[PDB]
RNA sequence: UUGAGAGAUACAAUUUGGGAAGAAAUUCCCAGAGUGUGUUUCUUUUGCGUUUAACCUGAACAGUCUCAUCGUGGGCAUCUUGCGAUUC
């Protein structure tokens, strides 16, 4: 129950403090003992929640970024009934680099809510995006395999898509959350909204997250913890640390 | 019921029990082997009489 | 032509090493193993143990069936982890050699057809509608 | 009697441990048969962690 | 480094070394027949290949009562190249002897060269089909091995059964289905063959297919029982 | 969705035979065997509909000249990134 009292302390101090109202998320920061192996790129790997949802694709504004020609992409995703109301805007990379420059990029950041791009263009994406999006780790775009078809060696790649599959993929990544792999010991992960759900949801959230990150299997995503997790601190971006689970 | 006792007629009549990897069948009786010409070939005689009474000639 | 020679030489090398391997090796047999008897009651009463008078594992082994009276590994160094490792190593080496041989003969055949593609005649290119490229010569006896 | 069968059993243990194998002999069965007879890319390895292992419930369901 | 293990039958040893192997105590050491290797432990020991020897396919196929022993006399119908028959001379050792027969003349010369070297083999170089020409020189064999591809195996083996078989004796035939009939199924052809021998007084006991060595060969082990 | 038969089974219960502990009743190693449904594989039968089907063959690539091979240069790194193989 000490965890829950500390969460009560955090949320009530969030109510009183003028700065703490103006940032509206909760981050769990973990310190373990050992440094982690994989170098820090910027592919946010996802983490599942089992009992509690977090956000809705029918609740956030979405940007999609394509391959080059984007014609069948835009028209099919617009016209075929599973994604007709989903994405705010679809645009290709070349069209983006032509269209937005500097202050226009900052206006994009101010306006749009969550960004997803094709896997085959994520590697180049942050260079046209710059580092205003790449301040820290909130608005990191994800990557989505569009066609449910795989390119073998020495064979021409087939173009297709399906709104079915892309809608399921967005509903997964918007239901549950994502973390970033590092090299140093300390790490951070966004968990939950202060009003969208409550303290039991947050505790169950933390339990499932630490369980999925402790589990030995599912290794490309969930085997991130090496050594023992020392402690978990709950904090906002502008609040302070509250210590739980110290051993 | 009586269907399964028809199959147990097959059971009392059959001559091959497998014991896992191994198998035992026994030697047919001398008087049978000596005082009967052996049985006919079902597949071959069926083939020849099928060739006779095929549908390609409108017999009957 | 010298390339076809070199690849052929290495292919024969691998073939002979595979044959010497198969000669020095030892497999295990599993075929139809029937046993006759004269009574159907004695047949239904047959038991492999009560016929061979051996143990469980001696019955279940077929490449070696010594009776208990004839039964009437310490020098072998760690048979639990080492000797099975070496048996598996020999058999995996032979499998590797066979696979290598198949690869080599494939490359040799492609190179041989290409080498024959250079001499004489009247050639004709077809595409086998699976997607193969091949040739066919005109009906033309050389002098 | 039990002693006779004991000497026998010792011999059986010797023979068994010399000869037998479990899954190693199965691997040997694989090798012997062949001797006597998942979403990744080829060029992009960041995808196979970066993807989302989507749920058939999150597909078929309409929220 | 290598250890031995004796077999159910005499003369037969399984060598447990760097690989398990089927081996027999040599008669004379340091002398090859078909380019095989050796192993010693001092005692000298000669391999068989279950491929190139059909009885080698039998032993590691597993046969309960093979009627070979050291001090006996065996008949071998079909000793081409002399390999398995020189090996059978090995397993009967010094005291026993084998009478091999053969008809084609290239393995004839090969077997007679092995007869020049090894004593316990006595060769007869005839067509098998008229046993008078070797009942002048053979008397009262104990056991019989028959690997002849001719389809009248029953006739030729019944002939040598009436002529030379020891009473209550042991006989082993090999059967190639794809040589006798070459269209139909293995156990079918086998049952027909052992029917032939049963009518020809040979009481069979077991048969066994040699699967991972041969293409649908089997061997039939039986006895000669109260017969002349 | 006409019959018959053969085999692999998965599970559910059933059961032979050797070793081993058992004062004993009972239990554990093994090699098994039969029954229930289910998963079939194959053989075969029955009816109905149908008379061709498939592959080859001769003077069957080629003036918008074709094809083989070695080389030169260019795109495709938002990827057919190309195997002694044929990226275009």
Swiss-Prot record, chain A:
Q: Which UniProt keywords apply?
A: Nucleus, Ribosome biogenesis, rRNA processing
Q: Which domain of life is it from?
A: Eukaryota
Q: Which GO terms describe its cellular component?
A: 90S preribosome; nucleolus; nucleus; small-subunit processome
Q: One GO molecular function term? A: RNA binding
List where in the cell it is found.
Nucleus, Nucleolus
Task: Identify one Pfam family in the record.
Answer: Ribosomal_L1
Q: What is its main location?
A: nucleus
InterPro entries recorded for this chain? eL8/uL1-like (IPR050257), Ribosomal_uL1-like (IPR023674), Ribosomal_uL1/biogenesis (IPR028364)
Any single biological process term in GO? maturation of SSU-rRNA
Recorded family membership: Belongs to the universal ribosomal protein uL1 family. Highly divergent.
**Subunit-level organization:** Component of the 90S pre-ribosomes. Interacts with FAF1.
The UniProt record's further free-text remark is: Present with 3060 molecules/cell in log phase SD medium.
Protein role: Involved in rRNA-processing and ribosome biosynthesis.
Q: Which PANTHER family match?
A: RIBOSOMAL PROTEIN L7AE FAMILY MEMBER (PTHR23105)
The protein's name in its UniProt record: Ribosome biogenesis protein UTP30
- Give the encoding gene's name: UTP30
Curated annotation (Swiss-Prot), chain B:
Subunit composition and interactions? Part of the small subunit (SSU) processome composed of at least 40 protein subunits and the RNA chaperone small nucleolar RNA (snoRNA) U3. Interacts with snoRNA U3. Interacts with MPP10.
Other facts: Present with 2120 molecules/cell in log phase SD medium.
Note whether Phosphoprotein occurs among the keywords.
Answer: yes
Basic and acidic residues bias spans: 38-52
**Which family does the record claim for this protein?**
Belongs to the UTP16 family.
Protein biosynthesis found in the keyword field:
no
Q: Where is it mostly found?
A: nucleus
For this UniProt entry, the molecular function terms from Gene Ontology, in alphabetical order, are: U3 snoRNA binding
Job of this protein: Functions as part of the small subunit (SSU) processome, first precursor of the small eukaryotic ribosomal subunit that coordinates the first two steps of ribosome biogenesis in transcription of the primary transcript pre-RNA and pre-18S processing. During the assembly of the SSU processome in the nucleolus, many ribosome biogenesis factors, an RNA chaperone and ribosomal proteins associate with the nascent pre-rRNA and work in concert to generate RNA folding, modifications, rearrangements and cleavage as well as targeted degradation of pre-ribosomal RNA by the RNA exosome.
Cellular component, GO annotation = 90S preribosome; nucleolus; small-subunit processome
| Localization per record | Nucleus, Nucleolus
Supply the name of the protein: U3 small nucleolar RNA-associated protein 16
Give UniProt keywords alphabetically: Nucleus, Phosphoprotein, Ribonucleoprotein, Ribosome biogenesis, rRNA processing
Renumbered residue ranges of the record's region Disordered = 28-60
From Swiss-Prot, chain C:
Q: What does the UniProt entry say about where the protein is found?
A: Nucleus, Nucleolus
Record text on subunit structure and interactions: Component of the ribosomal small subunit (SSU) processome composed of at least 40 protein subunits and snoRNA U3. Interacts with snoRNA U3. Interacts with EBP2, FAF1, MPP10, RPS16A and RRP14.
- Highest taxon of source: Eukaryota
* Keywords attached to this entry: Nucleus, Ribonucleoprotein, Ribosome biogenesis, rRNA processing
Its annotated function is as follows: Involved in nucleolar processing of pre-18S ribosomal RNA.
Task: Reply yes or no: does the keyword Lipid biosynthesis apply.
Answer: no
Show which residues constitute the signal peptide.
Answer: none
Q: Where is this region: Disordered?
A: 112-143
Portion held of the full protein? 101 to 250 of 250
Which Gene Ontology BP annotations are present? Answer: endonucleolytic cleavage in 5'-ETS of tricistronic rRNA transcript (SSU-rRNA, 5.8S rRNA, LSU-rRNA); endonucleolytic cleavage in ITS1 to separate SSU-rRNA from 5.8S rRNA and LSU-rRNA from tricistronic rRNA transcript (SSU-rRNA, 5.8S rRNA, LSU-rRNA); endonucleolytic cleavage to generate mature 5'-end of SSU-rRNA from (SSU-rRNA, 5.8S rRNA, LSU-rRNA); maturation of SSU-rRNA; rRNA processing; translation
For whether the record's keyword set contains Protein transport, the answer is no
User: What do the Gene Ontology cellular component annotations say?
Assistant: nucleolus; nucleoplasm; small-subunit processome; sno(s)RNA-containing ribonucleoprotein complex
Q: Which organism is it from?
A: Saccharomyces cerevisiae (strain ATCC 204508 / S288c) (Baker's yeast)
Return the protein name.
U3 small nucleolar RNA-associated protein 11
Q: Which family does it belong to?
A: Belongs to the UTP11 family.
Name the lineage. Answer: Eukaryota, Fungi, Dikarya, Ascomycota, Saccharomycotina
* Chief location category: nucleus
From Swiss-Prot, chain D:
Positions of post-translational Phosphoserine modification: 57, 62-63
Localization in the cell: Nucleus, Nucleolus
Which stretches are tagged as biased composition: Acidic residues? 57-63
Q: Where is this region: Disordered?
A: 38-63
Function text:
Involved in ribosome biogenesis, probably through modulation of rDNA transcription.
Q: What else is known?
A: Present with 3670 molecules/cell in log phase SD medium.
Report the family membership: Belongs to the RRT14 family.
Protein known as: Regulator of rDNA transcription protein 14
Q: Native species of this protein?
A: Saccharomyces cerevisiae (strain ATCC 204508 / S288c)
Species classification = Eukaryota, Fungi, Dikarya, Ascomycota, Saccharomycotina
Covered range of the whole protein: 112 to 203 of 206
């Amino acid at each position: 129950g000490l965890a829950e009292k500390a969460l009560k302390a955090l949320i009530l101090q969030c109510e009183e403090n003028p700065s703490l109202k103006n940032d509206k998320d909760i981050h769990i920061i973990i310190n373990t003992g050992k440094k982690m192996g994989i170098n820090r790129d910027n592919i946010p790997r996802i983490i599942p929640l089992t009992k509690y949802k977090l956000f809705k694709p029918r609740d956030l504004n979405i940007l999609l970024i394509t391959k080059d020609p984007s014609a069948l992409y835009r028209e099919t995703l617009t016209k075929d009934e599973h994604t007709s109301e989903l994405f705010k805007e679809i645009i290709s990379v070349k069209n983006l680099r032509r269209r937005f420059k500097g202050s226009k990029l900052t206006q994009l950041y101010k306006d749009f809510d969550l960004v997803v791009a094709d896997y085959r263009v994520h590697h180049l994406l942050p260079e046209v995006l710059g580092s205003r999006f790449y301040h820290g780790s909130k608005k990191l775009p994800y990557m989505i395999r569009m066609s449910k078809e795989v390119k073998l060696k020495r064979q021409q790649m087939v173009e297709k898509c399906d709104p079915i599959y892309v809608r399921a993929q967005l509903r997964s990544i918007c239901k549950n959350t994502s973390y970033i792999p590092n090299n140093d010991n300390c790490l951070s992960v966004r968990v939950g909204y202060i009003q969208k759900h409550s303290i039991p949801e947050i505790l169950q959230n933390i339990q499932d997250t630490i369980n999925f990150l402790t589990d030995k299997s599912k290794r490309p995503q969930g085997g991130v913890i090496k050594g023992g997790i020392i402690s978990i601190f709950v904090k906002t971006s502008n609040s302070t640390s509250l210590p739980i689970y110290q051993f | 019921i009586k269907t399964k006792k028809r199959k147990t007629l097959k059971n009392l009549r059959k001559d091959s029990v497998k014991r896992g990897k191994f198998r035992v069948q026994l030697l047919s009786t001398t008087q049978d082997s000596k005082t009967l010409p052996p049985k006919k070939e079902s597949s071959i005689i069926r083939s020849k009489d099928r060739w006779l009474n095929r549908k390609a000639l409108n017999k009957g | 032509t010298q390339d076809s020679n070199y690849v052929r030489t290495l292919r024969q090398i691998e073939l002979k090493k595979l044959e010497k391997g198969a000669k020095q090796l030892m497999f295990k047999s599993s075929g139809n193993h029937t046993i006759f008897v004269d009574s159907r009651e004695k047949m239904n009463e047959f038991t492999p143990e009560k016929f061979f008078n051996t143990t469980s594992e001696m019955v279940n082994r077929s490449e070696n069936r010594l009776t208990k009276d004839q039964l009437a590994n310490a020098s072998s160094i760690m048979p639990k982890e080492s000797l099975d490792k070496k048996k598996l190593k020999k058999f995996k080496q032979v499998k590797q050699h066979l696979q290598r041989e198949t690869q080599l003969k494939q490359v040799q055949q492609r190179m041989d057809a290409q080498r024959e593609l250079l001499k004489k005649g009247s050639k004709k290119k077809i595409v086998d509608s699976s997607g193969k490229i091949s040739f066919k010569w005109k009906k033309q006896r050389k002098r | 009697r039990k002693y006779l069968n004991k000497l026998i059993k010792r011999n059986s243990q010797n023979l068994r441990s010399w000869d037998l194998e479990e899954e190693v002999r199965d691997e040997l069965e694989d090798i012997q048969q062949s001797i006597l007879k998942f979403v990744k890319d080829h060029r992009y390895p960041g995808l196979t962690p970066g993807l989302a292992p989507v749920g058939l419930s999150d597909e078929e369901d309409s929220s | 480094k290598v250890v031995i293990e004796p077999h159910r039958h005499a003369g037969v040893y399984i060598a447990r070394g760097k690989e398990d192997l089927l081996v027999t105590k040599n008669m004379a050491p340091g002398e090859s027949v078909y380019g095989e290797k050796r192993i010693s432990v001092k005692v000298e020991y000669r391999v068989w290949n279950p491929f190139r020897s059909k009885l080698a396919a039998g032993i590691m196929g597993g046969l309960d009562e093979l009627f070979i022993a050291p001090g006996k006399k065996v008949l071998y119908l079909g000793a081409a190249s002399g390999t398995s028959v020189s090996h059978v001379s090995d397993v009967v050792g010094p005291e026993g002897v084998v009478y091999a027969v053969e008809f084609s003349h290239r393995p004839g010369r090969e077997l007679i060269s092995m007869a020049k070297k090894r004593p316990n083999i006595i060769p007869i170089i005839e067509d098998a089909r008229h046993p008078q020409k070797y009942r002048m020189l053979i008397g009262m064999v104990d056991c019989v091995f028959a690997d002849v591809a001719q389809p009248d195996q029953a006739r030729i083996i019944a002939l040598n059964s009436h002529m030379f078989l020891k009473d209550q004796g042991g006989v082993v035939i090999s059967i190639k289905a794809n040589c006798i009939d070459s269209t139909v199924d293995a156990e079918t052809v086998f049952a027909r063959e052992v029917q032939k021998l049963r009518e020809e007084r040979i009481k069979p006991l077991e048969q066994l297919t040699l699967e991972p060595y041969e293409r649908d060969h089997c061997i039939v082990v039986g006895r000669y029982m109260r017969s002349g």
